[PDB]
């Protein structure tokens, strides 16, 4: 306890381990900020609570770029049977994938895994969690459908994209910026600059920045087709966003 107060987490953790108080040792090692010894003592201790603690600690860290970290998280949640925790981990993985890689098929697979593990859970809110997952999954799958339809059908583009955009709270599952960007890109492919610029405007009034979802060269060609400077329009849009934030 004195070492904990003074910050000597290693000595306190070793003393607790030799005393059999493994949860205090895990807390001290988490406070230390080192991963390998925590994972090792989780593996030898084989306590489900320590498995959950190690899984949460690895979830806090950068599990995305290290496959070993996510492998250990999955193993810990399987050994501890923390089905809700594993479902939440898979949901977070899918959300990160959607946010910063835009790989909706991998996100759909992760949502399917999360739904399966939630269906293996026994919590009181499990069904609620399940339905939430499936709703997101459904929306993702619909967008994935459109992602295939880039080979076959324009009318199905318009119908499915408008249906997905009209759904409230879609950004919680599929970002509407990506949908608008792909609509604009398809319209440029058809070279219908009028409807492309109309959808550009529609994407503008939703107060989301065009740059993350749309290529700059795409936008500048489309705006040159209309015959208006893009810099002035961007400045006006930024000023409008600030003036809309002012009363809020």
């Amino acid at each position: 306890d004195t070492s904990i107060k003074q910050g000597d987490y290693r000595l306190s953790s070793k003393l607790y381990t030799k005393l059999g108080n493994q949860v205090e040792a895990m807390k001290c090692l988490i406070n230390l900020g080192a991963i390998d010894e925590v994972v090792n003592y989780a593996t030898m201790a084989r306590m489900p609570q320590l498995y959950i603690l190690a899984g949460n600690f690895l979830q806090t860290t950068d599990w995305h770029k290290n496959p070993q970290l996510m492998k250990h998280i999955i193993t810990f949640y399987n050994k501890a049977k923390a089905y809700d925790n594993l479902a939440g981990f898979f949901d977070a993985c899918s959300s990160v994938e959607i946010d910063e890689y835009r790989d909706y098929e991998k996100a759909a697979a992760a949502l399917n895994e999360a739904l399966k593990h939630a269906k293996k859970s026994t919590s009181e809110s499990r069904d609620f969690r399940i339905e939430q997952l499936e709703t997101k999954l459904n929306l993702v799958q619909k967008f994935v459908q459109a992602r295939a339809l880039f080979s076959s059908d324009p009318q199905q583009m318009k119908q499915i994209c408008e249906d997905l955009l009209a759904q409230p709270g879609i950004d919680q599952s599929v970002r509407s910026g990506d949908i608008y960007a792909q609509i604009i890109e398809y319209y440029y492919q058809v070279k219908n600059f009028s409807q492309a610029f109309d959808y550009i405007k529609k994407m503008q009034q939703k107060r989301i920045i065009l740059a993350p979802y749309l290529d700059q060269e795409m936008l500048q060609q489309i705006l040159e087709s209309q015959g208006v400077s893009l810099n002035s329009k961007n400045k006006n849009n930024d000023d409008e966003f600030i003036e809309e934030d002012v009363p809020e």
Binding site: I209, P212, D245
Partner: protein, 116 residues
């Protein structure tokens, strides 16, 4: 909070795609906004730019960003920035950092006065 967070996040994202094409100083100054300390310190480590670190620490809040100034002073000490370390420690007023600097500087009279 929510509106400020949303706007700051969007502009930091735009900062990321702009620094991908390459803009380090002008972009870094444009996207300071409020509490971008992690991205700013990553930029400064990448560019080895310590003047922005000093600007942040002198503009940092005294009662909430204490550890940030401590680690900035540690970076100054490991980079042989003696005067920046002194001013950061004077803002810190922590005996731990001052004693660490005194022992690392290999002198013993200021060690007298700080130990006393």
């Amino acid at each position: 909070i929510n509106s400020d967070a949303s706007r700051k996040d969007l502009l930091i994202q735009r900062a990321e795609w702009e620094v991908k094409q390459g803009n380090w100083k002008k972009g870094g100054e444009l996207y300071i906004q409020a509490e971008v300390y992690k991205k700013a310190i990553e930029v400064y480590v990448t560019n080895n730019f310590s003047e922005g670190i000093v600007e942040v620490c002198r503009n940092a809040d005294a009662e909430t960003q204490r550890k940030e100034i401590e680690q900035c002073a540690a970076y100054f000490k490991k980079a042989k920035l003696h005067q920046y370390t002194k001013e950061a420690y004077l803002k810190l007023q922590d005996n731990k950092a001052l004693l660490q600097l005194n022992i690392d500087l290999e002198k013993w009279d200021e060690a007298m006065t700080l130990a006393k």
